[PDB]
Amino acid sequence: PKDQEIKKLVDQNFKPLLEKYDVPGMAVGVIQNNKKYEMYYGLQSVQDKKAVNSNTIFELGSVSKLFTATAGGYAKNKGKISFDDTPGKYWKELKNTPIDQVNLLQLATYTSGNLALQFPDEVQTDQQVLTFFKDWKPKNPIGEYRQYSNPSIGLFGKVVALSMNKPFDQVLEKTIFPALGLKHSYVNVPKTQMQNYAFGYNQENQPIRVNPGPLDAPAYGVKSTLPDMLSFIHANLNPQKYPTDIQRAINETHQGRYQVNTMYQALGWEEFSYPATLQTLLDSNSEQIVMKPNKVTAISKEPSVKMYHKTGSTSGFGTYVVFIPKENIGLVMLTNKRIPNEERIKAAYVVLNAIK
Numbered sequence: 524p525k526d527q528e529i530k531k532l533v534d535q536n537f538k539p540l541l542e543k544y545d546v547p548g549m550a551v552g553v554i555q556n557n558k559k560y561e562m563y564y565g566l567q568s569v570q571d572k573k574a575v576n577s578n579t580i581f582e583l584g585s586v587s588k589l590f591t592a593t594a595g596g597y598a599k600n601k602g603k604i605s606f607d608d609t610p611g612k613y614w615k616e617l618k619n620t621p622i623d624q625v626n627l628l629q630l631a632t633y634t635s636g637n638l639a640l641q642f643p644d645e646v647q648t649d650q651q652v653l654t655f656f657k658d659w660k661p662k663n664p665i666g667e668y669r670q671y672s673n674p675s676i677g678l679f680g681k682v683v684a685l686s687m688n689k690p691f692d693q694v695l696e697k698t699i700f701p702a703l704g705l706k707h708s709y710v711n712v713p714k715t716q717m718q719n720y721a722f723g724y725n726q727e728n729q730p731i732r733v734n735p736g737p738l739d740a741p742a743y744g745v746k747s748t749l750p751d752m753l754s755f756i757h758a759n760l761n762p763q764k765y766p767t768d769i770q771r772a773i774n775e776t777h778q779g780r781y782q783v784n785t786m787y788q789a790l791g792w793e794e795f796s797y798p799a800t801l802q803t804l805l806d807s808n809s810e811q812i813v814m815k816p817n818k819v820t821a822i823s824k825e826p827s828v829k830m831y832h833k834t835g836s837t838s839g840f841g842t843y844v845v846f847i848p849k850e851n852i853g854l855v856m857l858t859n860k861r862i863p864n865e866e867r868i869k870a871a872y873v874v875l876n877a878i879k
């Protein structure tokens with residue numbers, strides 16, 4: 524059976540990474556032709572002696588940005604925002620400031636020109652975040668240079684929230700997650716689910732969870748189970764099978780906005796021409812693309828067959844999601860220890876290419 528063939532493939536390619544990087548726990552999911560396969564290894568909690576299972580909640584880290592993107596696509600297609608609007612229109616305390624000449628799409632796709640990977644260490648309180656954006660001044664020409672930025676998509680998320688007259692946590696938990704059919708996906712894990720919330724483990728194998736941070740939720744703050752992430756990949760593979768509002772939201776996240784070498788930047792998702800070589804997928808995670816600013820080029824020819832992926836990490840967790848529309852296949856990897864991005868991409872590449 525397919526069940527045993529997939530289990531064997533994941534056992535050969537993913538299971539060895541547990542001994543190699545000393546990973547307490549892992550969840551790997553495959554969806555093929557609307558059939559879900561769930562593999563669980565090791566411990567959700569070392570001290571509590573809890574096995575990883577279908578209820579285990581993991582930190583998605585930067586894979587959170589896919590839900591922020593989906594929320595933006597939902598708001599835009601319900602006419603709550605336009606991608607040509609500026610933050611001042613919704614956050615009135617930023618009206619007539621320099622950041623108010625950056626549009627929402629530029630914030631969402633990291634092209635503000637002067638927003639780094641992280642906020643400064645001193646930015647913490649709601650007031651210090653508002654001050655940081657009021658005191659913001661341009662550097663590189665607005666819209667020309669991609670620099671991967673938590674603050675950038677953070678502000679986009681806050682604006683999307685204001686546009687729908689809810690806090691961001693409520694936008695996901697009350698609108699987007701239910702619309703996608705996600706039952707155990709959280710910005711804030713409730714008291715009744717804390718026994719299902721995995722500990723992350725650092726490079727010394729000490730337990731750690733993600734700390735509150737300035738505009739954390741939209742950038743890296745979402746937690747989910749393997750079954751919920753498999754449902755999210757199913758939605759991305761079959762957006763036609765969902766209500767108009769969320770279908771339009773999903774399709775909005777799949778549209779390439781600009782290009783950097785072999786990579787097309789969509790809303791949240793990273794987009795590639797399919798078939799993609801292993802090295803094209805590894806290049807997306809290169810220090811050059813991730814750490815440093817890069818000149819963006821216009822889309823000349825939109826690739827006819829596309830493929831999408833996203834890596835994510837916190838101090839304690841690793842995440843990788845990938846889906847190929849034309850093959851009706853996708854994969855999710857969740858670990859409660861950071862492993863190198865290259866090892867996640869390579870393992871996923873072998874499994875997806877080998878599946879019949």
Ligand SMILES: *C(=O)[C@@H](NC(=O)/C(=N\OC(C)(C)C(=O)O)c1csc(N)n1)[C@@H]1N=C(C(=O)O)C(=C)CS1
Pocket residue numbers: 584585586640673733734743813834835836837838839864
């Ligand atoms: C999304 O996953 C981003 N990661 C983060 O913002 C966090 N960690 O990033 C690293 C670079 C690992 C760090 O040590 O700060 C993060 C969020 S909350 C928390 N406790 N850590 C991007 N991910 C990576 C990555 O692959 O790890 C990056 C290279 C740059 S930011």
